[PDB]
Design a binder for these strands. Structure first.
Ligand SMILES: [Mg+2]
Ligand SMILES: [Mg+2]
Ligand SMILES: [Mg+2]
Ligand SMILES: [Mg+2]
Ligand SMILES: [Mg+2]
Ligand SMILES: [Mg+2]
Ligand SMILES: [Mg+2]
Ligand SMILES: [Mg+2]
Ligand SMILES: [Mg+2]
Ligand SMILES: [Mg+2]
Ligand SMILES: [Mg+2]
Ligand SMILES: [Mg+2]
Ligand SMILES: [Mg+2]
Ligand SMILES: [Mg+2]
Ligand SMILES: [Mg+2]
Ligand SMILES: [Mg+2]
Ligand SMILES: [Mg+2]
Ligand SMILES: [Mg+2]
Ligand SMILES: [Mg+2]
Ligand SMILES: [Mg+2]
Ligand SMILES: [Mg+2]
Ligand SMILES: [Mg+2]
Ligand SMILES: [Mg+2]
Ligand SMILES: [Mg+2]
Ligand SMILES: [Mg+2]
Ligand SMILES: [Mg+2]
Ligand SMILES: [Mg+2]
Ligand SMILES: [Mg+2]
Ligand SMILES: [Mg+2]
Ligand SMILES: [Mg+2]
Ligand SMILES: [Mg+2]
Ligand SMILES: [Mg+2]
Ligand SMILES: [Mg+2]
Ligand SMILES: [Mg+2]
Ligand SMILES: [Mg+2]
Ligand SMILES: [Mg+2]
Ligand SMILES: [Mg+2]
Ligand SMILES: [Mg+2]
Ligand SMILES: [Mg+2]
Ligand SMILES: [Mg+2]
Ligand SMILES: [Mg+2]
Ligand SMILES: [Mg+2]
Ligand SMILES: [Mg+2]
Ligand SMILES: [Mg+2]
Ligand SMILES: [Mg+2]
Ligand SMILES: [Mg+2]
Ligand SMILES: [Mg+2]
Ligand SMILES: [Mg+2]
Ligand SMILES: [Mg+2]
Ligand SMILES: [Mg+2]
Ligand SMILES: [Mg+2]
Ligand SMILES: [Mg+2]
Ligand SMILES: [Mg+2]
Lengths: 195, 113
RNA sequence: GGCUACGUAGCUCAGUUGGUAGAGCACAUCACUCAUAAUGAUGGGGUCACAGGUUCGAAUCCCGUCGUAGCCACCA
RNA sequence: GAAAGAAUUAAAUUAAUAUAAUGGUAUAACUGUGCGAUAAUUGUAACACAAACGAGUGAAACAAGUACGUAAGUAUGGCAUAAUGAACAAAUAACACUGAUUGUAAAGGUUAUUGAUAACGAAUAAAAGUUACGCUAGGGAAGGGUAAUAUAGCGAAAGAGUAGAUAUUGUAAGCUAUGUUUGCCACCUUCGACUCAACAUUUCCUCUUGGUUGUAAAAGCUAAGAAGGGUUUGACUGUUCGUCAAUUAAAAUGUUACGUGAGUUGGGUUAAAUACGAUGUGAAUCAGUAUGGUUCCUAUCUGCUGAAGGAAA
RNA sequence: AUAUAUUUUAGUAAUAGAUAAAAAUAUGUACAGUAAAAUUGUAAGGAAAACAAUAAUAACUUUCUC
RNA sequence: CAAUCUCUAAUUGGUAGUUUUGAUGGUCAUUAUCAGCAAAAGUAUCUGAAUAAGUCCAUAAAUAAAUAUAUAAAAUU
RNA sequence: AUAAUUGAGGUCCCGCAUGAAUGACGUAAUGAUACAACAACUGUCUCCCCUUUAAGCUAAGUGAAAUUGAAAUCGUAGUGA
RNA sequence: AAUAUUUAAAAUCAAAUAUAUAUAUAUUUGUUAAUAGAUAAUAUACGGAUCUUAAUAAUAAGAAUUAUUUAAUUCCUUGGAAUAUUAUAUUUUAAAAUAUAAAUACUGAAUAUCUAAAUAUUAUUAUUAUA
RNA sequence: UAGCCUUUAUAAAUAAUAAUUAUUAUAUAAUAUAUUAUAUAAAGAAUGGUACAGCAAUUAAUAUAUAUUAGGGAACUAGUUUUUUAAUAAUAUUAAAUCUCGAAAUAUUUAAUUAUAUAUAAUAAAGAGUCAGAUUAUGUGCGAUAAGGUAAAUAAUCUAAAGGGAAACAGCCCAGAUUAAGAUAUAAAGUUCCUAAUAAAUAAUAAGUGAAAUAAAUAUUAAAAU
């Protein structure tokens, strides 16, 4: 509903920033969560405007609405407010006025997701290709068995990466603050703190 | 047009004296906005929460179990002392005065009340 | 920072050189006219500008600052 | 087993903080309450932080006095970081320091206090415009870059096309090229006409060819090859352009310092004169209108057009 | 029971608790305490007036008791 | 009266000497807070600010609260 | 009006932003003023051609000028204050 | 063969290094190409020539592009050893055997060294005449 | 005026610059469950909140044949169910200049030790010049993730630096000219010729692709792996 037009109460101008190249191997929003088939970015990290996203959504919908129990999950919201000065105006003299909403999209991230009752995968693939024709990146069809993109030419299965109880790890190799707290909890300090 | 071209300078609010550093009485160990560091052993605190040394010694940053979730800056009277000092041991104190070996000076001091 | 002189009724204005709550004025009802209205008579509200003293007796004198613009000073 | 107390643990600083925002604050800096109303005191302040100077900030300690607290102690205004202004010249007090012959005085000094210089390190107590009649010293304290726009193309194809997205058409969004427009940058300080044109091809005509339920024929439409040859004369306007008239096989689009003023012109743009409308108190002014109105050059080199001499044939 | 005299009371006014997030003295000091939101309710009361209630007691001290 | 000399006041582009900030098409110039600021500190531009400041708060809730009531004392009665 | 007129004249009046001695309006005459039309004329032009004289050119004599860091001073593309 | 993905060393396998060590653990490395798309104005414009190899047939050429490498090739632990190569000499019948060598790729600065000269300073000397 | 530069000097002078040690844990050995030594591992005394990472709280975004709160319809005789409309909850998934509960490296930075002394700091007395900067790389603000643009941050070079390379070249890659000499090591860059110097190995390309200034989506044709 509000993914292409956030309702920040205090509307305000924003700096340009940069699209996060996720050097640490994030895989956040790079996985199929809601649907069966999806459309992910394949190229270098890119900014997608609100209008472009809307058009992609519309393109996808043409295939989704005919389906029985058809659904489209829009995975990303255009949260960054972009202002622009005109091409007509000189440089300097303040910042330009609000123009459009935009989203910073890392390399591996999923944009859309679909799942119908009577949805064959070929149709879904076609729809997602047609959606990609309207967006500024280069995109890729992603199924539930197809594995998570991280880099431009690199891949990963989330099933592989290890599970860890971090409290236990902390206890094993404790910080100074934690040790101080533990000492405080002990009786030769707790009795004589005198509050 | 109307531009937002106005800002105060930076308040120089780092630590002004570091761990293991020799100090003198009066010297500022920390400038800060509110007690990020609390005044520890042999150390005072000012109006602007500025930690300053009460005695000559060695600046030490530490945690104390009595005050968990609070960082401290204190001044150890020597380099030998671990400055979160043992609680039930006697306080390491500085006399900090000198006897008036000079006779006249001693006499003057005796006279003065 | 000091010094003035003015601020009655909803409107306009008296009154002022002390022993007064007065006047038309626009406003609502009767009156008169064929039927309007001009004209004739009904009444209307004032802490006599916030607020204290001297004469049994001051709206008027004296006397605190509200207020309105002045005036002086200081203006390096 | 029960009651009461002491409390501890968890959570919380999201409330509250005189006031912005940030940091801090429950051990509370927040809140309530007694006393008080004192420390919103007086002389010396080292040493640090910050820092060009001028200033600014934290502050141990020594001495005088005060308030609260059983005491320990705490208080030199406010949880902190804004809340401000130099000298000079005046003004008011206190000080007992100087007292221009001596004594008084005046006047100056010390100490405390006063009002502003917001263009806010404050030039004076006190200062706005105009010039196309202008002058001097200097500085540059279309080309180049860019490609948002513009022009052209490509991919995908919603949708028109009597039916069929792709004969022809092709929304909004996607990917490029160009440096032909309008911009942006600031390295770098004249429009049109005439004359002669050279180059490009993104081809307007002519030649070859693919597609065209939308190629029966004929006219077309669209696309590929193709730059050999060719591609206008008049009325209006300074105009390029545009409107129209009459033609043409066609009347293509650019580049060349938007080719070409040491080749011509000077209608536009342009200074001195003048008037009009508007603006201004005015001098005068204008992304205004109108009449008038100033540059010249024998060619040294390059280059090109012709013509000789010398030469190694 | 009634008369006079001399007095006394009635000026009728909130805090009764070291009060603790209604409002009020914004700097000192001493002592003490904890806010807010949300939720469940309740006369007018309704989304929005007020009041109530809403985390855990192991160990410790004292008291009574099987 | 008026004229002249000396003093004093009103008026003046009549006339003379000067001036017309730095940054911009009325707005910004001093101070504080955060971001920009890249985990010390500092850090700019006609950068973004729900930006904020030229302050505000004091002489006050007092007085009374132990020798007392007739008579007699004054070792506290 | 012209084959065709952003010019000229006539007329209309949302006069962006006319107006009465900063005069208003309509005429006769005048004007090397400015704009437009008709006639006549023409080398202005279609479209240039021929001729004449003075230069230009050559020989003799006399003899400048601006300019000039030094020059043994080609094209193209690239580069580069 | 057919259909549909992916173009990957994360997982997986293989190979190598390091810790106890015939194994385990940890680390490191290994996963497409071509063409079209393609484009303006003085003149082709990798700096230019030019570069993709070919038997017969050479004492002889065969990227001068892209990617990963080496300094002849293979094991052992920069070094040695073996292997063939190449060149040469000797001996024997243009070949065979023996042995010697080459294997340190090279170019390259006004860098460094060496080689000499100068000045200045520091520290030692020698000779000659604040010695 | 300070910053940076120069000259002359001063010491009860190393205060300067660089690194190490400093910590945590494990195993082994020796003393009294602790201490010391040895070895190994760990981005390893103190200070920090950027990258990264994350969705906690704040600010934002999405989904539920899930639950609650009411509303709009709807079927039988006001009660009830369903298809729902918003809010709240629950669960799952997401991001931000002014969010950071996790969190680097670089950084700031302290003592002693070692190494630099033909070297540094500090102080004293004196002289300046400079206050138009440029480019390259990285991280940003503005611009349009445009500019040989603009604004600052860090480093280097140019400025003021000749020499080799990058065709030519202020700022790029090497390297700092006291004067020569030219044997030896070389740097960056090169070794068919122009032009100083070359031979190999294994793959791939056939397009002159390319050969020192890499042009995109997309299309076609192959090639591997599943
Ligand atoms: Mg992120
Ligand atoms: Mg700040
Ligand atoms: Mg406060
Ligand atoms: Mg706060
Ligand atoms: Mg400092
Ligand atoms: Mg100073
Ligand atoms: Mg306080
Ligand atoms: Mg003055
Ligand atoms: Mg005298
Ligand atoms: Mg000024
Ligand atoms: Mg100033
Ligand atoms: Mg000034
Ligand atoms: Mg002035
Ligand atoms: Mg004029
Ligand atoms: Mg250009
Ligand atoms: Mg159709
Ligand atoms: Mg379109
Ligand atoms: Mg036909
Ligand atoms: Mg063509
Ligand atoms: Mg021909
Ligand atoms: Mg004509
Ligand atoms: Mg031109
Ligand atoms: Mg010319
Ligand atoms: Mg010329
Ligand atoms: Mg004339
Ligand atoms: Mg004048
Ligand atoms: Mg911060
Ligand atoms: Mg910062
Ligand atoms: Mg930093
Ligand atoms: Mg910082
Ligand atoms: Mg006409
Ligand atoms: Mg004409
Ligand atoms: Mg007039
Ligand atoms: Mg006239
Ligand atoms: Mg005349
Ligand atoms: Mg002659
Ligand atoms: Mg040059
Ligand atoms: Mg691996
Ligand atoms: Mg070319
Ligand atoms: Mg080359
Ligand atoms: Mg040398
Ligand atoms: Mg100086
Ligand atoms: Mg040292
Ligand atoms: Mg930040
Ligand atoms: Mg944290
Ligand atoms: Mg400057
Ligand atoms: Mg620049
Ligand atoms: Mg210079
Ligand atoms: Mg150089
Ligand atoms: Mg240098
Ligand atoms: Mg040198
Ligand atoms: Mg080529
Ligand atoms: Mg090239």
């Amino acid at each position: 509903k509000h993914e292409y037009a956030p309702r920040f109460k205090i509307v305000q101008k924003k700096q340009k920033g940069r699209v996060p190249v996720r050097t640490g191997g994030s895989i956040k929003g790079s996985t199929l969560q809601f649907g069966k088939y999806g459309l992910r970015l394949k190229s270098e990290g890119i900014r997608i405007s609100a209008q472009q996203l809307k058009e992609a959504d519309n393109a996808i919908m043409r295939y989704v609405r005919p389906l029985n129990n058809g659904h489209l999950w829009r995975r990303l919201c255009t949260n960054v407010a972009v202002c622009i000065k005109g091409n007509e105006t000189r440089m300097g003299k303040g910042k330009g006025g609000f123009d459009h909403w935009m989203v910073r999209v890392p390399t591996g991230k999923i944009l859309f997701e679909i799942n119908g009752d009577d949805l064959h995968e070929k149709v879904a693939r076609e729809a997602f290709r047609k959606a990609g024709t309207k967006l500024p990146g280069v995109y890729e069809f992603v199924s539930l068995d197809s594995l998570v993109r991280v880099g431009l030419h690199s891949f990963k299965n989330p099933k592989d990466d290890p599970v860890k109880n971090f409290y236990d790890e902390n206890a094993k190799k404790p910080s100074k603050k934690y040790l101080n707290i533990l000492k405080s909890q002990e009786p030769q300090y707790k009795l004589f703190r005198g509050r | 047009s109307r531009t937002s071209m106005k800002d105060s300078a930076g308040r120089r609010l780092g630590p002004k004296k570091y761990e293991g550093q020799d100090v003198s009485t009066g010297e500022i160990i920390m400038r800060q906005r509110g007690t990020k560091f609390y005044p520890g052993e042999n150390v005072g605190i000012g109006k602007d929460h500025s930690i300053f040394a009460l005695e000559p010694g060695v600046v030490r940053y530490y945690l104390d179990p009595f005050h968990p979730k609070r960082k401290f800056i204190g001044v150890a009277l020597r380099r030998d002392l671990k400055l979160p000092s043992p609680h039930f041991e006697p306080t390491v104190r500085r006399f900090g005065r000198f006897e008036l070996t000079n006779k006249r000076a001693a006499y003057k001091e005796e006279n003065s009340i």
